[PDB]
Amino acid sequence: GSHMASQVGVIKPWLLLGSQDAAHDLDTLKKNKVTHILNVAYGVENAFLSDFTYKSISILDLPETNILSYFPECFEFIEEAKRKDGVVLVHANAGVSRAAAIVIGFLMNSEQTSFTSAFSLVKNARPSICPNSGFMEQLRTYQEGKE
Template identity: 65%
Template sequence: MHSLAEEIKTFSKASLRKQCTHVTTLTGKRLLETWKDSALRVEEEEEEEGACGYVQDFSLDLQVGQVRPHVLLASQDAAQDLDTLRKLKVSHILNVAYGVENSFPHLFEYKTLNILDLPETPITSYFRECSQFIDEAKAKDGVVLVHCNAGVSRSAAVVIGYLMSREGLTFDDAFALVKAARLAVRPNPGFYQQLKAYRPQEMERDHARDVNLEEH
């Protein structure tokens, strides 16, 4: 058995394994960081086709939040899963995603609005049309599934706007209710500010005035 002193004498830095770290930047560039002789060496690796600067999650998100008995909130995965839709007795689907096709046009009543998840998108301008669709489903004792791509920003903003418009809830109360139904909810900063400034009564009054002007 070697003593500790003998092991120290025979120790060599060359026997140490190099420590390497693979890094992917936001633009998809892949880098290899290697520590050698107390110095960091960075090399660019060959890019993979379709690489992105985040960990891609290909798992299905079938979690559906029930905001009201007739209003459900989810991602596109739930909207494309027939078993989930039937289990929840969905009759209407409000699709506010961008570039997501309706999977079962002969089984459910759809309304589709291609909305971009960008802070500058005027999300409140879509509330009136979305709320009317939800109202129509409710009048038929139906259940509406509202979805975008991830069920985080656009669809959440639409449901929050619906609660503020139809139930007179404040933004804070509506946001808390929707967040409790689906924890992943997080409208982008632009939507958040628009919702805080949203005044349903004023928008309805302005809409009625515009309609009267057009008629005359």
């Protein structure tokens, strides 16, 4: 639909979580010092191609989507933005399910923190998160083989 105001969540100094409206808000991308944009929706345009480094990974917000399977490509890119001393916006469409799951899993992977703690960090930053129940269960299981 038509563009609306948005509120991104701060996950790390260098890692933001938000919606496609945030991805399409040049005023706030500027203010937030964004350098990198990770688009994990389906069919959302990258609007400012000369202005940011982009990565698009097509993902469907369905409970049968295996969110874990997209982690390497997402986490690679997130780490690129960090290594460059930039800021990455991770977004999808609503930015409450796919994109939320990616960031929760990124915290679990990068710092070996629990699902419950990663989830709480992300939801405190972005109270609108609400991952689909497939993603939820997938995240609960993630990396349990290393215990």
